[PDB]
């Protein structure tokens, strides 16, 4: 849970600007858009990184390249690599980070409009963020369905297969016989309707607040390299302040910077620490963290 700054440079002044904006607009809410960066401190292994036990197990299993684990065609031809990744990444194996708890604090303070996440770890929900405020753009393991006929299956059927040694006899649909898989969006598949639908509604909400207070969209720990999720930032209203907390400037913040863009090069957990400080909520935060 302990963090430190990424470099000798201080980001407290930049983080202070954010707290100042929220101070001047006490009845405004914030929309977060997050990626893998906010869960790195949780110890979740990056399947694309050698030196991770997961990477080598997938390589030993003949996975051709990391992302084939999230490819429909590959899964149907050989589901073992995905099952192996699921065993290691299944929700419940990790604990939320300081940044995940920040989302909870904001909710408690009624300043959370929505959190759009590309992650499948569901640590936002595990941390106590309400279902209504979360948009898991790439799905999660909480639901399962047959890839052929769409029949619904309880998530526990899939989960029970992961505890077997070795993992074999994968879940097959008792209607059409095809493989059943967790509701995780694989490369090549459309995201769930709720993604576009909610962004449609939040986009109007954003544009309408510009004319009344002022909202704020904060992008954290994402390389903005996966679409359509990566299109959100450019679609934020020109008149709505965009904030980016990432080790490096990426996506629209790099391709089309905006005068009002606030860029903060900092670890998501350190950022959380500094924001809570500048907001004066250290007391409530500590309570949540110790709860």
């Amino acid at each position: 849970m302990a963090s430190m700054s990424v470099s000798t440079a201080s980001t407290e002044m930049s983080v202070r600007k954010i707290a100042a904006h929220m101070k001047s607009n006490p009845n405004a809410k914030v929309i977060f858009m997050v990626g893998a960066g906010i869960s790195t401190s949780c110890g979740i292994p990056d399947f694309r990184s050698p030196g991770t036990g997961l990477y080598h197990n997938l390589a030993r299993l003949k996975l051709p390249y990391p992302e084939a684990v999230f490819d429909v065609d590959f899964f149907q031809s050989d589901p073992l690599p995905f099952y192996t990744l699921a065993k290691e990444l299944y929700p419940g194996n990790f604990r939320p980070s300081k940044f995940h708890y920040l989302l909870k604090l904001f909710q408690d303070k009624d300043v959370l409009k929505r959190v759009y996440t590309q992650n499948i770890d569901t640590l936002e929900r595990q941390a106590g963020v309400k279902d209504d405020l979360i948009i898991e753009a790439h799905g999660s393991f909480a639901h399962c369905h047959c890839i052929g006929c769409g029949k619904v299956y309880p998530p526990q059927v899939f989960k029970s297969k992961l505890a077997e040694h070795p993992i074999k006899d994968f879940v097959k649909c008792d209607v059409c016989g095809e493989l059943v898989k967790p509701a995780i969006v694989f490369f090549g598949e459309d995201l769930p309707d709720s993604f576009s639908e909610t962004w449609l509604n939040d986009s109007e909400w954003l544009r309408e607040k510009i004319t009344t207070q002022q909202p704020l969209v904060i992008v954290v720990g994402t390389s903005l390299a996966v679409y359509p999720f990566a299109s959100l930032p450019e679609e934020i209203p020109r008149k709505v302040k965009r904030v980016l907390c990432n080790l490096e400037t990426v996506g629209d913040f790099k391709a089309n910077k905006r005068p009002t863009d606030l860029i903060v090069h900092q670890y998501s957990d350190e950022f959380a620490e500094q924001l809570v400080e500048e907001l004066g909520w250290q007391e409530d935060f500590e309570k949540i963290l110790t709860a």
């Binding site: 790439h138 969006v185 694989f186 490369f187 090549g188 598949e189 459309d190 995201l191 309707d193 993604f195 576009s196 390299a225 996966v226 679409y227 359509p228 299109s231």
Partner: peptide, 7 residues
């Protein structure tokens, strides 16, 4: 909607 998940 935006299309299918991709790079």
């Amino acid at each position: 909607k935006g299309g299918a998940k991709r790079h």
